[PDB]
User: Which sequence fits this backbone?
């Protein structure tokens, strides 16, 4: 999920 | 070289902008901030205050050693509201640290750079040529150019989607 927020 | 600053009215509320508006990194909490239609509500993104219609313009960027950051330029029209893919079709030409590797964020597939450890990076925006270019200050080694037919105002873009890392504008 973290990288999905780029 | 351009003295750019961060636009706190564009910033994701989960971001933390430095006092002088040159730095950005992820916080662990949303903030009460007066949601504009211009603010990035979901993606961990902030533009610079100053955008460009025409010309060549340089900014420099101090990057972290740990994953989380992408940056480059976005066309003004880049969607702010909702979860948005991070890709050229969505108006975003960027470099990225992820899995301890530098990528030009292209699609359908991302392009891996075989550049060395990066500390500081010069961003050359040539609107009259139609290109954004990335150089390591460390010897002005060319990292990557995106050739782009920009048809509108183009803004400096920064995203930090993990704690433990950051981006700092120089100068």
Assistant:
């Amino acid at each position: 999920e973290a990288l999905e927020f780029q | 070289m351009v003295e750019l600053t961060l636009d706190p009215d564009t910033a994701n509320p989960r971001l933390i902008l430095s006092l002088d508006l040159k730095g950005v990194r992820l916080g662990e909490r949303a903030q009460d901030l007066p949601n504009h239609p211009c603010r990035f509500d979901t993606n961990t993104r902030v533009l610079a205050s100053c955008g460009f219609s025409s010309g060549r313009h340089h900014w420099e960027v101090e990057v972290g050693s740990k994953d989380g950051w992408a940056f480059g330029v976005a066309r003004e029209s880049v969607r702010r509201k909702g979860l948005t893919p991070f890709t050229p079709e969505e108006g975003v030409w960027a470099l990225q640290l992820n899995g301890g590797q530098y990528w030009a964020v292209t699609s359908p597939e991302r392009s891996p750079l075989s550049c060395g450890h990066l500390s500081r990076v010069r961003v050359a925006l040539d609107l009259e040529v139609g290109a954004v270019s990335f150089y390591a200050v460390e010897d002005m080694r060319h990292l990557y150019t995106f050739r782009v037919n920009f048809q509108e105002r183009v803004f400096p873009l920064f995203s930090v989607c993990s704690t433990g890392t950051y981006l700092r504008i120089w100068p």
In short: Chain A has no helices and no strands. The interface with chain B takes residues 2-6 of chain A (CB under 8 Å).
